[PDB]
Curated annotation (Swiss-Prot):
Free-text domain note: The presence of a 'disulfide through disulfide knot' structurally defines this protein as a knottin.
Family named by the database record: Belongs to the cyclotide family. Moebius subfamily.
Biological process annotations from GO: defense response
PTM notes: This is a cyclic peptide.
Function in brief: Probably participates in a plant defense mechanism. Has cytotoxic activity against a variety of drug-resistant and drug-sensitive human tumor cell lines.
Protein name listed in UniProt: Varv peptide F
Pfam families per the UniProt record, alphabetical: Cyclotide (PF03784)
Source organism of this protein record: Viola arvensis (European field pansy)
Annotated keywords: Disulfide bond, Knottin, Plant defense
Domain of life: Eukaryota
Disulfide bridge partners, by residue number: C5-C19, C9-C21, C14-C26
Location in chain, cross-link Cyclopeptide (Gly-Asn): G1-N29
Length: 29
């Protein structure tokens, strides 16, 4: 849930293992 990954889930993909792809943002827990 916390956006400490700083990745956009726009393409439906996150590089940070553990981060959820909460379109359009990758959030970890």
């Amino acid at each position: 849930g916390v956006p400490i990954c700083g990745e956009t889930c726009t393409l439906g993909t996150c590089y940070t293992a553990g981060c959820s792809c909460s379109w359009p943002v990758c959030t970890r827990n």
